[PDB]
């Protein structure tokens, strides 16, 4: 599927992920292309703070959903 992540630079980047993907995997997928290390990324989805262990399908993150990137 395709999911959007909204970064600290104003940018909204599209991401290619699968429902079984872990959130740690998505943080890496942001790191390589946006240069932000997975430990600096705090991911939020519509007021729910995500955890590296669970997956996108555990949080009902369907296609064309939008995650928010928060600093720390």
């Amino acid at each position: 599927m395709q999911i959007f992540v909204k970064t600290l630079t104003g940018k909204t980047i599209t991401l290619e992920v699968e429902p079984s993907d872990t959130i740690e995997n998505v943080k890496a997928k942001i790191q390589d292309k946006e240069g932000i290390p997975p430990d600096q990324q705090r991911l939020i989805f519509a007021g729910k703070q995500l955890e590296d262990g669970r997956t996108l399908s555990d949080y009902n993150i369907q296609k064309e959903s939008t995650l928010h990137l928060v600093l720390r």
Binding site: G10, R42, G47
Partner: protein
């Protein structure tokens, strides 16, 4: 047809300035005379002696009405645009041209009056919390000011903008500077305007930072804006003109029903002493009209507006400006100091002695919107940390203090858990002078208890 309350009230006032009784008076307590009769509210000399740099709008309005003395509306906004529907023995512009449709030569001048005289920030914590975004990130920031207009008594018939909160739209401080005139900002602000109207708040101005740490380890900053550089740049002046045009001031006394704007522009930057200070401005009606006609641009120099070319889209006549050495008339082309388009306002905070009338009890404690780059997200965790404990406790004074918060309210409303009636109830519990009864109704309400439920299990 429907003016703001402050305009209806100042209209009824005469604005007469009393004068000292004179040794030359030779009436007793019987009437007045040429030496002791009061000054009219626009008295140029009274304003000079007391260092008031512009007369107020309603002082100006009363000056125009004495000079009118059948009806002709005393106020009309300038329009410099070529008349394009001219089919007077020639094709319309750009194919044909004649004296009826082309604009005459323009002469720009410092505006003698200002729509708003003073900017009062209801609490200095409002300014400090806004500045935190620059302190944490190093990026300059801008926000829109919410509040209302009311009387200001340090100048005849004066008006002040009373600022109750600041809202920051999404922004990044990059290769284009601050970006306010963009679709994303405009569409979010429409939503905020609507919700803050339900709180009895108008969008009354713009504030933005131009802050550079001075390297002295005392919090001081460089003085970049001053009489020998620039106050607002050309691009900032152009932006104020668009804002003012989009926030028109309603007036019975104008043929169109509108005249200029009460929208104010504030910049936080260093003063000549190196302190972080506020400078407040509006632009002239000539600047509004120039920008409507698309006649000026930013130039290489911040203090200089560039005058645009005649094209097949817009016609640009000669433009002059009245420069003061005493004055003289200069050709404004190719560029002219954008100074002549400004009016300057004062600013302040209410004195801490007396009771407050601020709509909101607190301006901090809950993350403002659009501060993710600052490590401040609006979360169910953050709302629970802020609210849940205090909500369960059943302490009404403490619950009142916590929900009396502009950004907290907007965030809860965005969750769309409370009904429109329950949202009205939360608003009343936050801003009302007599809030107890409303807070009770709210806390027992259904939507509210759902919200407290959601936070409880949100954890």
């Amino acid at each position: 047809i429907k003016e703001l309350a402050v305009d209806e009230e100042l209209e009824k006032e005469d604005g007469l300035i009393p004068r000292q009784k004179s040794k030359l008076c030779k009436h007793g307590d019987r009437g007045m005379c040429e030496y002791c009769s009061p000054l009219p509210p626009w008295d140029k000399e009274y304003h000079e002696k007391n260092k008031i740099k512009h007369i107020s709008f309603h002082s100006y309005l009363k000056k125009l009405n004495e000079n009118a003395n059948s009806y002709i509306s005393p106020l009309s906004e300038p329009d410099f645009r070529i008349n394009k529907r001219c089919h007077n023995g020639h094709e319309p512009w750009p194919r044909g041209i004649c004296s009826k449709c082309q604009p005459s030569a323009i002469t720009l001048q410092q505006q003698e009056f200002r729509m708003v005289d003073h900017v009062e920030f209801q609490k200095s914590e409002i300014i400090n919390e806004f500045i935190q975004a620059w302190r944490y990130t190093g990026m300059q920031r801008f926000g829109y000011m919410y509040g209302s207009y009311s009387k200001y008594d340090n100048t005849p018939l004066g008006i002040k903008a009373v600022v109750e909160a600041i809202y920051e739209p999404p922004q990044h401080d990059e290769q284009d500077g601050l970006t306010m005139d963009v679709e994303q900002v405009k569409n979010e602000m429409l939503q905020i305007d609507r919700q803050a109207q339900e709180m009895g708040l108008s969008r009354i101005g713009l504030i933005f930072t131009d802050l550079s740490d001075a390297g002295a380890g005392d919090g001081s900053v460089f003085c970049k804006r001053h009489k020998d550089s620039f106050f607002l740049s050309s691009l900032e002046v152009i932006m104020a003109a668009r804002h003012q045009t989009r926030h028109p001031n309603v007036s019975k006394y104008s043929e169109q029903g509108f005249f200029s704007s009460k929208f104010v522009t504030c910049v936080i930057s260093g003063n000549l002493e190196g302190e972080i200070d506020i400078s407040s401005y509006q632009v002239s009606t000539e600047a509004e009209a120039l920008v409507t006609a698309d006649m000026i641009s930013g130039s290489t120099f911040p203090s200089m507006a560039y005058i645009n070319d005649t094209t097949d889209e817009r016609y640009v006549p000669e433009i002059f400006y009245m420069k003061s050495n005493i004055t003289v008339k200069e050709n404004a082309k190719p560029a002219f100091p954008v100074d002549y388009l400004l009016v300057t306002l004062t600013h302040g905070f209410p004195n801490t002695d007396t009771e407050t009338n601020s709509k909101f009890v607190s301006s901090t404690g809950f993350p403002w919107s659009n501060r993710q780059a600052m490590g401040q997200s609006q979360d169910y965790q953050e709302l629970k940390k802020y609210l849940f404990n205090v909500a369960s406790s059943g302490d009404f004074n403490l619950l009142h203090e916590k929900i009396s918060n502009f950004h907290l309210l907007l965030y809860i409303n965005s969750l769309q858990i409370l009904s429109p009636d329950e949202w009205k109830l939360l608003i009343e519990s936050a801003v009302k002078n007599e809030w107890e009864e409303s807070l009770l109704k709210l806390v027992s309400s259904a939507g509210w208890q759902t919200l407290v439920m959601i936070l409880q299990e949100s954890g």
